[PDB]
Each structure stands twice: as structure tokens, then as C-alpha cells.
CSV table of N, CA, C and O in Angstrom, one decimal:
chain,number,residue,atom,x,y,z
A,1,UNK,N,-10.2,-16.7,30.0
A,1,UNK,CA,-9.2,-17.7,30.2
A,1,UNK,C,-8.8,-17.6,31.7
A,1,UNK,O,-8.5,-16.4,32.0
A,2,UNK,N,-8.7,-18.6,32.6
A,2,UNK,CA,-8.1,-18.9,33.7
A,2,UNK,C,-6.9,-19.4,33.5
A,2,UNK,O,-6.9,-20.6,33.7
A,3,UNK,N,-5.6,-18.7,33.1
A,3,UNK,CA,-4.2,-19.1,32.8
A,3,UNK,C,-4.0,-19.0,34.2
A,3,UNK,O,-4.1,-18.0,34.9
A,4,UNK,N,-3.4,-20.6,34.7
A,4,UNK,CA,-2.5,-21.1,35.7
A,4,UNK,C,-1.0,-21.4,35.2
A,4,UNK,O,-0.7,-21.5,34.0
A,5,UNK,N,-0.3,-21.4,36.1
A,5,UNK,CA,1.0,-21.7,35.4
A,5,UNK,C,1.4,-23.0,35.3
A,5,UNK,O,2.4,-23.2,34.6
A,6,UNK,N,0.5,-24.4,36.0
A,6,UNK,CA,0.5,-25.5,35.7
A,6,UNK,C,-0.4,-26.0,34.6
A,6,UNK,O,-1.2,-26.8,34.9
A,7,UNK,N,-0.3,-25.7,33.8
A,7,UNK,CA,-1.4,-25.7,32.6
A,7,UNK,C,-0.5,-26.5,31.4
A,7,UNK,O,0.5,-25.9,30.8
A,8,UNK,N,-0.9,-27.7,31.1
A,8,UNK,CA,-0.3,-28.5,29.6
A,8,UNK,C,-0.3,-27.3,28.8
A,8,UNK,O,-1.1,-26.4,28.8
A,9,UNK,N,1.0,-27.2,28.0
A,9,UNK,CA,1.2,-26.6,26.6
A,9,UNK,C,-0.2,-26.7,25.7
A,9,UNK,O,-0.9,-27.7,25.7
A,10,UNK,N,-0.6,-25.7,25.1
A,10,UNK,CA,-2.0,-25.6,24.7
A,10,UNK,C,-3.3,-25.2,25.3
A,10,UNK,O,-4.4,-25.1,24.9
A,11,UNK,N,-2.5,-24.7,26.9
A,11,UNK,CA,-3.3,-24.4,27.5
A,11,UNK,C,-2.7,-23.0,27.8
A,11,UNK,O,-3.3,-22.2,28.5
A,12,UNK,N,-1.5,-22.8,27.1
A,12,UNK,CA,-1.0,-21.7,28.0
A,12,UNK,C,-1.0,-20.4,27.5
A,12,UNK,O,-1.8,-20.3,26.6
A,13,UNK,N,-0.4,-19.1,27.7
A,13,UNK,CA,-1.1,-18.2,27.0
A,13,UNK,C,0.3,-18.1,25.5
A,13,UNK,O,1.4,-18.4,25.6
A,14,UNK,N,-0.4,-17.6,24.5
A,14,UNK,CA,0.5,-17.4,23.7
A,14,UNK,C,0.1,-16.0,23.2
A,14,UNK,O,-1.1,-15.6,23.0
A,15,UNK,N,1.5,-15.1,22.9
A,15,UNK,CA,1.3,-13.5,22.0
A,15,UNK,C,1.2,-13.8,20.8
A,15,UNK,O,1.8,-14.7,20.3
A,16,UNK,N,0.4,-12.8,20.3
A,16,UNK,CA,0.1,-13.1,18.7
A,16,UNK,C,0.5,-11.7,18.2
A,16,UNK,O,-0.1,-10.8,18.8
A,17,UNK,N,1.1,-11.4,17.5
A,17,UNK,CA,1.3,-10.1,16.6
A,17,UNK,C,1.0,-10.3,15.1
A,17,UNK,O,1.7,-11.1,14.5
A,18,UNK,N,0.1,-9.5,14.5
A,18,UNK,CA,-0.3,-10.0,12.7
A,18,UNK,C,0.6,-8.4,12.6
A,18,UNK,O,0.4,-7.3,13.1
A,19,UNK,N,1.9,-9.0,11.4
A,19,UNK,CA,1.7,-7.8,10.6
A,19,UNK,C,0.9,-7.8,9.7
A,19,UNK,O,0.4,-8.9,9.5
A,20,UNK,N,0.4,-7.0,8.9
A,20,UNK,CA,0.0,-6.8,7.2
A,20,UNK,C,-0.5,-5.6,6.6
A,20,UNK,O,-1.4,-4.7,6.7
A,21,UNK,N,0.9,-6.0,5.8
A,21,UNK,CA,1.4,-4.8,4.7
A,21,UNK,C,0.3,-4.5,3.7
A,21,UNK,O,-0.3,-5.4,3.1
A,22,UNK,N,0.0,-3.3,3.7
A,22,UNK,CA,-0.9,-2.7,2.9
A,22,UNK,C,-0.5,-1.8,1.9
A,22,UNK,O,0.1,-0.9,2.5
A,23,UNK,N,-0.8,-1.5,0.2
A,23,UNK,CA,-0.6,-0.5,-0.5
A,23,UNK,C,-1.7,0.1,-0.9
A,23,UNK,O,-2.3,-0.1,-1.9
A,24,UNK,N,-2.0,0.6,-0.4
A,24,UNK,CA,-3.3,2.3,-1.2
A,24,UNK,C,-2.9,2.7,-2.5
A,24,UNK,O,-3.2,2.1,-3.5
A,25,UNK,N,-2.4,3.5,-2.6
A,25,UNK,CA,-2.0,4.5,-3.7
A,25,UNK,C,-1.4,5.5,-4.0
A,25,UNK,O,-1.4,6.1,-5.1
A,26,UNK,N,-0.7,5.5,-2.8
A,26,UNK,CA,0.1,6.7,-2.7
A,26,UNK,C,1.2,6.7,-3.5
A,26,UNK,O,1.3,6.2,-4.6
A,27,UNK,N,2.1,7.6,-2.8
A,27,UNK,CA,4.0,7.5,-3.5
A,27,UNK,C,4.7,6.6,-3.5
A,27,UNK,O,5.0,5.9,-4.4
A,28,UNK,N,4.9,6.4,-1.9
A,28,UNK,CA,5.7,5.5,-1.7
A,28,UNK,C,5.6,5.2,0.1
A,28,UNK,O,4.6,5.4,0.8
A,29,UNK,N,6.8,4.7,0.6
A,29,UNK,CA,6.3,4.7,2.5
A,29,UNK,C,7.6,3.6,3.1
A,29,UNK,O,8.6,3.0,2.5
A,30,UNK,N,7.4,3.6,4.1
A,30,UNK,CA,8.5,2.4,4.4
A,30,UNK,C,9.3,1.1,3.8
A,30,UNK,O,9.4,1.2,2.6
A,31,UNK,N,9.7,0.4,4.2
A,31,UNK,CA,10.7,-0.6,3.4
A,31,UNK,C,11.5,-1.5,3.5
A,31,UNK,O,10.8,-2.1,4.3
A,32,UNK,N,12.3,-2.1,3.4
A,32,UNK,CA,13.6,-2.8,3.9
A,32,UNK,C,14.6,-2.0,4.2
A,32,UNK,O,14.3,-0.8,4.4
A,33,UNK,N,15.7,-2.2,4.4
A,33,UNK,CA,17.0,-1.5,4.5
A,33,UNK,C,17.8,-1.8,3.1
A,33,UNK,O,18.8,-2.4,2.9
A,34,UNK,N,17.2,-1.3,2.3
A,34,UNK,CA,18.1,-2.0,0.5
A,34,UNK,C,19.6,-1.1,1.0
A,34,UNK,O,20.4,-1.3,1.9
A,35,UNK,N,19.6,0.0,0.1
A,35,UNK,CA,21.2,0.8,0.1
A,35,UNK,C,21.2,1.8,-1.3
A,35,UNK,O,22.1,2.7,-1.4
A,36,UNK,N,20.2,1.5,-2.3
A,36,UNK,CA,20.0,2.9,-3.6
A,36,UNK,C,21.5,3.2,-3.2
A,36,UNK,O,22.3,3.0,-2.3
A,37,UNK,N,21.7,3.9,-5.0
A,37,UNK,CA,23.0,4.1,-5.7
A,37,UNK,C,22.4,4.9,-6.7
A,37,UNK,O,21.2,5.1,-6.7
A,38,UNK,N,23.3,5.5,-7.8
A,38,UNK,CA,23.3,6.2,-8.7
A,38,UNK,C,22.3,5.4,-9.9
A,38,UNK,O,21.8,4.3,-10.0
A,39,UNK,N,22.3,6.5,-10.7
A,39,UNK,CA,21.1,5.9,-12.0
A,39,UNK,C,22.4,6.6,-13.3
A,39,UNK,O,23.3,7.4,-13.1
A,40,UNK,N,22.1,6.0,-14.3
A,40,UNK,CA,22.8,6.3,-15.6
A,40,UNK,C,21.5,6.0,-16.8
A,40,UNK,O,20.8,5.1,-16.5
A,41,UNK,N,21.3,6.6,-18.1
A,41,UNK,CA,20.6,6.7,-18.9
A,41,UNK,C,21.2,6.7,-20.4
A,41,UNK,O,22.2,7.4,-20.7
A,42,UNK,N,20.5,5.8,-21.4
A,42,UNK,CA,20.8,5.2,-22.2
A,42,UNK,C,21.9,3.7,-22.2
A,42,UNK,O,22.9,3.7,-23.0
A,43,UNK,N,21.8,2.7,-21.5
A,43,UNK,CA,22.2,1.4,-21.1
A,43,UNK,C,21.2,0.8,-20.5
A,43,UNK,O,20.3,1.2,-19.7
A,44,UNK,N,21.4,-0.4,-21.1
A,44,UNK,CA,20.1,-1.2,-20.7
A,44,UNK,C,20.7,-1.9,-19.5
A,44,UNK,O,21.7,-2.6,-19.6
A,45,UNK,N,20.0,-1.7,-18.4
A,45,UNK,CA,20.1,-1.7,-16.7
A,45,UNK,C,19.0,-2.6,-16.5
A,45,UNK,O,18.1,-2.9,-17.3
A,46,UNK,N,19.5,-3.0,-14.9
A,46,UNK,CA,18.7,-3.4,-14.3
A,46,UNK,C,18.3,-3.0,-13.4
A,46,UNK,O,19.0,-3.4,-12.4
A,47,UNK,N,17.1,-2.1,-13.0
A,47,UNK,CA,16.7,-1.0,-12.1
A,47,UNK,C,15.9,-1.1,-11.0
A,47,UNK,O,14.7,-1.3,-11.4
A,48,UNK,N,16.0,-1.1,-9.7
A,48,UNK,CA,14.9,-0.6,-8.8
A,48,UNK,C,14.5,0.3,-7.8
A,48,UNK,O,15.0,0.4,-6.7
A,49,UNK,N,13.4,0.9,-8.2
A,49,UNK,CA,12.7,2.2,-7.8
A,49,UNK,C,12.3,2.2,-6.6
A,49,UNK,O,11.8,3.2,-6.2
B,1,UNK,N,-34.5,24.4,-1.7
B,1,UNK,CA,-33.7,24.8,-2.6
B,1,UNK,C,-33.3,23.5,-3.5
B,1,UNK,O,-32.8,22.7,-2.8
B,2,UNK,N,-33.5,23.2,-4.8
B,2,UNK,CA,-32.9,21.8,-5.3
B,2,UNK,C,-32.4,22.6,-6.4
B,2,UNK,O,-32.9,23.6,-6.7
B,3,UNK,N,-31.0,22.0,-7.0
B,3,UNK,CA,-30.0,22.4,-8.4
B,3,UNK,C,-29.8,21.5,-9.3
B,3,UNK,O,-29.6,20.4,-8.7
B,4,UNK,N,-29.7,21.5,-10.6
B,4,UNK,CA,-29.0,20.6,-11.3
B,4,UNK,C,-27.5,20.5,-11.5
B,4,UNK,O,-27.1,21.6,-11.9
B,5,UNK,N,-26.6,19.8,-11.4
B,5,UNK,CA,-25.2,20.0,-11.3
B,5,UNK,C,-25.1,19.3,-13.1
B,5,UNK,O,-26.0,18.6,-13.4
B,6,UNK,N,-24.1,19.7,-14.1
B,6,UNK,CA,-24.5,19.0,-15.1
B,6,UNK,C,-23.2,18.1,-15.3
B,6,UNK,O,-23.3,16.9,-15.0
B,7,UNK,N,-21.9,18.5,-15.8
B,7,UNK,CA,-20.9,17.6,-15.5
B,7,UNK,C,-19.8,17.9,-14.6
B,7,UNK,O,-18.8,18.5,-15.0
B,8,UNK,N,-20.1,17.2,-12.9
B,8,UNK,CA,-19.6,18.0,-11.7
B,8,UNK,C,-19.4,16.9,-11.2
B,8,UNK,O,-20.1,15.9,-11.3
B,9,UNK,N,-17.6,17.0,-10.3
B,9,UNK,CA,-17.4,15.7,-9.6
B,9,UNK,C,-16.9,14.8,-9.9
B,9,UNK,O,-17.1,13.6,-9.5
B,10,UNK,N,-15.9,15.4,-11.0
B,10,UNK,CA,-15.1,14.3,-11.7
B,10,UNK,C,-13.5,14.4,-10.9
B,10,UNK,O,-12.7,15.2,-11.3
B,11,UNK,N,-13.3,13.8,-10.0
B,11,UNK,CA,-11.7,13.5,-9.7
B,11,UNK,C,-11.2,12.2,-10.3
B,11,UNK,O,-11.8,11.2,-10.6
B,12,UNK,N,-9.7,12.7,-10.4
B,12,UNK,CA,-8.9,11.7,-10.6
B,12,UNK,C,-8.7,10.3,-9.7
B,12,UNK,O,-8.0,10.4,-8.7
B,13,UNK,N,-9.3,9.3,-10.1
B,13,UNK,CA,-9.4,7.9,-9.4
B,13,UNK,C,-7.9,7.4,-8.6
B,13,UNK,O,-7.7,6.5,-7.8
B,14,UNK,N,-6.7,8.3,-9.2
B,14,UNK,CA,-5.5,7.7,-8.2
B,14,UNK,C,-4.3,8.0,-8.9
B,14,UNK,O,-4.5,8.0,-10.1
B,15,UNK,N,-3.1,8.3,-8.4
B,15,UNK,CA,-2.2,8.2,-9.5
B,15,UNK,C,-1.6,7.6,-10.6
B,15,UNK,O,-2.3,6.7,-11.1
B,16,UNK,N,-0.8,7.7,-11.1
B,16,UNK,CA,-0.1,6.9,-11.9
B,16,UNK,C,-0.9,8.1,-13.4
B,16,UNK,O,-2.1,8.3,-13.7
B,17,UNK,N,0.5,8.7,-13.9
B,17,UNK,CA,-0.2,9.4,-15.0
B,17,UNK,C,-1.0,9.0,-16.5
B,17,UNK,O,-1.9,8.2,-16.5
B,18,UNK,N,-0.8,9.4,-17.3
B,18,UNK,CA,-1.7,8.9,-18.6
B,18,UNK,C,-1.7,10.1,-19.4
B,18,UNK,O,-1.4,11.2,-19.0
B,19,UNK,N,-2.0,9.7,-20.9
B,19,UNK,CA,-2.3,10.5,-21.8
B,19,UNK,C,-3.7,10.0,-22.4
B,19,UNK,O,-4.5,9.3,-21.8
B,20,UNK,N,-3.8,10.4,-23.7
B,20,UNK,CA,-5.2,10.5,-25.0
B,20,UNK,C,-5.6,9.2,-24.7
B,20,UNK,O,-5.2,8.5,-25.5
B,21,UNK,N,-6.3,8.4,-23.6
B,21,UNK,CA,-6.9,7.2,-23.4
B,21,UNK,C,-7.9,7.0,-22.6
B,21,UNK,O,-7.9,6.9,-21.4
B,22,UNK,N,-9.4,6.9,-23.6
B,22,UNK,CA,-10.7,7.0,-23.2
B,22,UNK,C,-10.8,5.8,-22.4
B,22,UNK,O,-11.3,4.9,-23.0
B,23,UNK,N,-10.3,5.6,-21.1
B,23,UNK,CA,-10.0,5.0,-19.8
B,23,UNK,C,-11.3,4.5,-19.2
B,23,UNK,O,-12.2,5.3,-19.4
B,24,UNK,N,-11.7,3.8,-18.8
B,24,UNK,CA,-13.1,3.2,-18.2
B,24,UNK,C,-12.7,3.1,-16.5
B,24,UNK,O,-13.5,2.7,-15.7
């Protein structure tokens, strides 16, 4: 590519970053920012691990 | 030197546990 800086839109350079998230098999690994809390047993809950 | 191995080489395919289940 010969990027000039007079160059129509489409001509110009653009950054590309791909994420993509992958699961194998493991335990577990990175995340969002959730906030996890306590667990209690025998009540029917709505739970995530 | 050649060997016969007879039933050799069996790991477990990945986590997640299990019980009594003839598993394919």
C-alpha cells in the first residue's frame, strides 16, 4: 500500500483488531467484571458459577 | 526391538466428572 494522506476515504489506512474468545477445557480463565456473592443450600436459587 | 502394548493409553478425554456410564 502507498498510503498518502490525500487519499479518498477507502483509500486510507484502517486498524483492525479481531478478538476471539476461545474455550478448551479447562477450569475456568478470564471474564467480565460481574461482583460473586455468597451461596446458600437447600432454596431454589438462581445461580452463577 | 518391536512390543505388543495390550490395553495401554487410555486418558481421560477432558474434564467434567462421571460415574457407571459406558461413554462412547
Amino acid at each position: 500500500y502507498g498510503f498518502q494522506p490525500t487519499n479518498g476515504v477507502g483509500y486510507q489506512p484502517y486498524r483492525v483488531v479481531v478478538l476471539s474468545f476461545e474455550l478448551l477445557h479447562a477450569p475456568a480463565t478470564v471474564c467480565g467484571p460481574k461482583k460473586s456473592t455468597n451461596l446458600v443450600k437447600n432454596k431454589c436459587v438462581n445461580f452463577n458459577f | 526391538a518391536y512390543t505388543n502394548s495390550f490395553t495401554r493409553g487410555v486418558y481421560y478425554p477432558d474434564k467434567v466428572f462421571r460415574s457407571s456410564v459406558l461413554h462412547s
